[PDB]
C-alpha cells in the first residue's frame, strides 16, 4: 500500500548500503563498481559521469 | 560520513584481512550487544567499523584478545 | 495561492572568521538561483565600502621603474596597497601616509593614525626595506565608493576594491520537505576582506534589494 | 567530451579582453572580474598566486 | 539557397543566434546554433523497460 | 507535419493505407468523427446502384505493437474533394503527410553537462504543450479455464477482499467502461474453487474504454454479457 | 541609491505589453530583470479548466455524434482556453450548444464574476441539425503546472491536465535613462506577453511582493 512511513524508512536502509551498478557486457574489472544510492524521483539510474 | 577507506589501508596495509577485520568487528557489533569505541553519528555499523579502524584503536590483534579475554572471564564466573 | 514555503537559515556553520557559509533551506522550485544571483550580483557589483584610489611615492615617478633599498619592485607595492582593507567614516575620502625608514618589513601598522581611519588587518606587509638609507613613503588617497572600479577606466592608479567581498559565489542542490518532490536549498559561500561580517554583509545586500522592491510592493 | 572541453575554452588565451594588462592579487580576484564580466576569460594578465 | 531563406527573413545568415543564459541571465559569449529539428519520440519508454 | 521535409511524406501517407483516401470525387455531405460522408460528382456516378459512398473511419483500437491508431477527419463541410486525395487524417499523419513525431526548437550547447554524452534536456514547457504523450492501448485476457476440482466463475464477491477493490466492479464481476483503474486493482473477478482474479499490472495507470466477452456454446450467460 | 517606479504601461494589444521600470542604478537593471522574469514565467497565480463533465461521454477516448472533433482534442482545446474568474477561487461553468456550426468560446453561459478574455477561441464542430453538448467545464484558481496524473471521483468527470500560467513570454530590455542631469541609470523595458487573463501591473506588483517576501528571512 505504499505508506507515508514506508518511504520515511526507505532512506534509512538506503543511507550508506552501496549497490553494484553494472552494465551488460563487463569487459574488464572496471564493469561492476559500487555506489552509494541517493533516492530521486524519475524510474532512470542516474550515473556520475565521470565513470 | 565515509567516502574511502585509504587511511584505513594504511592503518592495516593488507586490503583484504581488512575487510574481514571490519566484517568480524561489525559483526560482533550487531547481532550482539558490544558497544561501539566511537560514537556513531546515525550510520550503518560498516563504517563504525570502518572508523574503529581508521583512528587505530583496533585490529586482529585487539579483537582476538578482547575475545580470548571476554572467554576466560565469562569461563571464570562460573565458578 | 500566495502560500510559499519560507526559507530558513538551517546552519551557518563556517570556517575561521570573514569565510562564513550560509545554507537557507527549503526554496521553492527555482527561487534558489533566483536568490542567488540577486545577492552575489548585489555583492559583487554594489556594496558600500571603501578601498584605496591612487597611490604617491615620492622616490618614483612613473609605474614602471625601481627606488633603491626595496628588494620589491613597485608593481608588487601597488599589488600589495590594493588589498589594504581599511574602514572609514563619514568622510568620502583621506589620505594616508606612510612615512618609515630602517632594515625590516613595512606592515600596515606603521601608516600615520589619522583618528578614525583603522586598518582591520595591520599584519599586511607593504614592502620590504634592506638598506640604511632606504628612506620610504607615499601618499596614499582611500576614497569611499560602490562596486569595482579598473585602473584603466579612471600619482599611480590602483585598482579600488570597494565591495567588502573579495570571492562570493553561491550553489543550488535538490533538497525535500516531508513530502514534495522538488526543491531548492540555496548554499551561499562568501569571503570578505574583514572591514565587515559576512553574515552582516548579506543582510546588507538584502537590505539593499529590498529597499528597491518598496516602491511598488503591496507591503 | 564536456569537461575537457571546458577547461580548454577556459584555459586558453588571446590577445585582446575587457581588461588584459591588468594586476591581480589572486584566484579570487580573477572569479570576480570574471564573474562581473570587466575581463575576458581569455586574458593575459600576471596574478599573485601561493 | 539555405542563406538566402534566412536573409528572406529577419535571422542571421550565419545561423547563430545569441542565447541569454536562463538562470544566470548574462550573455553567452558565444553565438550559438537554434532551429527548429525534427524531433522524434521512440517507444523504447523507460517504465516498459524499469 | 516536419518542416524540413522530403515530399515523399505525401506518398507514404496515402499509400500504407492509414489515411482514408477518397476513392470518388465530390462534395462532402456529413463529416462526423466516426464516418465521412461524400455526394459525388455526377460525372463519376453509375447508372445504377450509383447512390453515395460512405466511409467508416477506425477510432481508438489497439495496433500490433500497443500504440494508438486513430482515424480523424481532416476536411470540413461542403469541401469539394477531388480523386485520390486524404479524407480522414490517420496516426501520426496530417492531411496526408507523414508526421513521425513534432518540429522542437534546438539549440548546440552544452548546459551543465545535463546533456553529458548523447542526453537531451527538455524544458518543462514541452509537456505543457502537450506534444510527447502518447496513448498506449493495451489488451488483458481472464480466460475462466474449466480445470479441475471444479469450473470456476467470473463472479462480483472475492473472499478475504475487502469492498474498496470491488467498488468500481458492477454485481456481475467485470469492470465498468470508463473506469479510471490504478495500477493494482481489480478488472475483473475470477475465483477457483479452493483467488485468482485478472489485476491491472504493477505501476501502469489507464482507463478502461473497451471489454469485450466471448462464452462457449454451452455456458448461457451472465449478465454483463 | 536611486529607487525605480512603474512609469508607463505600453498596451500594444489586449494579450502583451510592454512595462517600464525606472530609474536603475548601474547593474541593478540586469538583476531586476532576472529575478523578474523567472518570478513571472514560474511563479504567476492563474485559472484554468481543470475538469470536463460531457453529459452523453464516458471516458476521454470515446466519441460522440455531431461534434467533428474527438473527446479529447475538445479537452485538448478546452485545456488551451483562458479565464479570468474575479471573485471565488472555485467555479463550475456550463456549455450548451445546438445547430451546425462552431462551438465559440463565447456560448459559455457566465455568471457575473466570470469573464472570459478570448471568445473567439473554437472548441469544436457539430455537424447536425439536431445534435448538442452539455458539459459541465471546472474552472479553479492554481500556481505553476499540476498534471491530471498527480492530484490525490465518478466515471462522468475527465481530468485535464492544467496550466496555472498567464505569463507566457517575458523579456526585458535594459538601456540608459534619459534623466534630468546623471549618468549611469538603467531604463527596465520588461515586454511581457501574458494569455489575457491578468493586467501586467498586478503581474509586477506581486512578482515584487513574492521577491520582497523571499527576501524577507533576513
Not at chain 4, 584566484?27 to 572580474?33: G, S
Amino acid at each position: 500500500r505504499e505508506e507515508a512511513v514506508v518511504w520515511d524508512i526507505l532512506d534509512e536502509v538506503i543511507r550508506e548500503h552501496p549497490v553494484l551498478l553494472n552494465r551488460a557486457p563487463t569487459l574488464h574489472r572496471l564493469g561492476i563498481q559500487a555506489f552509494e544510492p541517493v533516492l530521486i524521483e524519475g524510474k532512470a539510474i542516474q550515473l556520475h559521469p565521470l565513470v | 560520513a565515509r567516502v574511502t577507506v585509504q587511511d584505513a589501508v594504511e592503518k592495516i596495509g593488507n586490503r583484504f584481512d581488512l575487510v574481514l577485520v571490519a566484517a568480524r568487528r561489525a559483526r560482533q557489533m550487531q547481532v550482539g550487544g558490544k558497544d561501539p569505541l566511537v560514537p556513531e553519528e546515525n550510520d550503518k555499523t560498516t563504517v563504525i567499523a570502518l572508523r574503529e579502524i581508521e583512528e587505530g584503536l583496533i585490529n586482529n590483534q585487539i579483537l582476538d584478545v578482547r575475545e580470548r579475554q571476554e572467554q576466560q572471564e565469562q569461563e571464570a564466573a562460573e565458578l | 495561492v500566495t502560500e510559499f514555503l519560507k526559507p530558513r537559515l538551517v546552519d551557518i556553520e563556517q570556517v575561521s572568521s570573514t569565510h562564513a557559509k550560509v545554507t537557507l533551506e527549503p526554496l521553492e522550485r527555482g527561487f534558489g538561483h533566483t536568490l542567488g544571483n540577486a545577492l552575489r550580483r548585489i555583492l559583487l557589483s554594489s556594496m558600500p565600502g571603501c578601498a584605496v584610489t591612487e597611490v604617491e611615492i615620492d622616490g618614483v615617478l612613473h609605474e614602471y621603474s625601481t627606488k633603491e633599498g626595496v628588494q620589491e619592485d613597485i608593481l608588487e607595492i601597488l599589488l600589495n596597497l590594493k588589498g589594504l582593507a581599511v574602514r572609514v567614516q563619514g568622510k568620502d575620502e583621506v589620505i594616508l601616509t606612510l612615512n618609515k625608514s630602517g632594515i625590516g618589513p613595512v606592515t600596515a601598522a606603521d601608516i600615520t593614525h589619522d583618528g578614525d581611519v583603522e586598518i582591520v588587518k595591520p599584519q599586511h606587509v607593504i614592502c620590504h626595506l634592506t638598506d640604511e638609507n632606504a628612506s620610504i613613503s607615499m601618499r596614499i588617497k582611500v576614497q569611499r565608493g560602490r562596486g569595482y572600479v579598473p585602473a584603466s577606466t579612471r600619482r599611480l592608479l590602483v585598482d579600488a576594491c570597494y565591495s567588502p567581498v573579495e570571492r562570493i559565489a553561491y550553489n543550488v542542490e535538490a533538497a525535500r520537505v516531508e513530502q514534495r518532490t522538488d526543491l531548492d536549498k540555496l548554499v551561499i559561500e562568501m569571503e570578505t576582506n574583514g572591514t565587515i561580517d559576512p553574515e552582516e554583509a548579506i543582510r546588507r545586500a538584502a537590505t539593499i534589494l529590498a529597499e528597491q522592491l518598496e516602491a511598488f510592493v503591496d507591503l | 567530451q564536456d569537461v575537457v572541453l571546458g577547461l580548454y575554452y577556459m584555459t586558453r588565451d588571446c590577445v585582446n579582453a575587457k581588461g588584459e594588462g591588468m594586476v591581480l592579487t589572486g584566484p579570487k580576484e580573477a572569479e570576480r572580474l570574471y564573474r562581473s564580466g570587466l575581463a575576458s576569460l581569455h586574458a593575459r594578465v600576471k596574478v599573485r598566486i601561493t | 539557397e539555405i542563406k538566402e531563406l534566412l536573409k528572406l527573413g529577419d535571422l542571421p545568415t550565419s545561423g547563430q543566434i545569441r542565447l541569454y543564459d536562463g538562470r544566470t541571465g548574462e550573455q553567452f559569449e558565444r553565438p550559438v546554433t537554434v532551429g527548429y529539428m525534427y524531433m522524434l519520440k521512440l517507444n523504447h519508454l523507460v517504465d516498459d523497460k524499469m | 507535419k516536419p518542416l524540413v521535409g522530403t515530399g515523399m511524406e505525401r506518398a507514404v501517407a496515402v499509400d500504407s493505407g492509414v489515411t482514408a483516401v477518397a476513392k470518388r470525387g465530390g462534395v462532402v455531405q456529413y463529416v462526423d468523427a466516426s464516418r465521412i460522408v461524400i455526394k459525388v460528382n455526377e460525372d463519376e456516378m453509375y447508372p445504377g446502384e450509383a447512390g453515395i459512398d460512405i466511409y467508416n473511419l477506425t477510432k481508438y483500437t489497439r495496433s500490433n505493437q500497443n500504440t494508438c491508431i486513430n482515424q480523424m477527419p481532416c476536411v470540413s463541410l461542403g469541401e469539394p474533394v477531388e480523386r485520390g486525395d486524404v479524407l480522414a487524417d490517420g496516426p501520426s499523419t496530417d492531411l496526408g503527410e507523414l508526421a513521425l513525431g513534432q518540429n522542437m526548437r534546438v539549440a548546440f550547447m552544452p548546459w551543465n553537462g545535463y546533456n553529458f554524452e548523447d542526453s537531451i534536456l527538455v524544458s518543462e514547457r514541452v509537456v505543457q504543450e502537450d506534444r510527447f504523450t502518447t496513448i498506449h492501448i493495451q489488451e488483458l485476457a481472464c480466460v475462466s479455464r474449466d480445470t479441475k476440482l471444479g469450473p470456476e466463475e467470473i463472479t462480483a464477491d472475492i473472499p478475504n477482499v475487502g469492498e474498496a477493490a470491488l467498488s468500481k466492479l458492477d454485481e456481475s464481476g467485470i469492470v465498468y467502461i470508463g473506469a479510471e483503474v490504478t495500477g493494482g486493482d481489480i478488472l475483473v473477478g475470477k475465483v477457483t474453487p479452493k483467488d485468482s482474479s485478472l489485476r491491472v499490472p504493477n505501476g501502469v495507470s489507464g482507463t478502461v474504454i473497451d471489454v469485450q466477452v466471448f462464452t462457449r456454446d454451452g455456458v448461457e450467460k451472465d449478465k454483463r454479457a
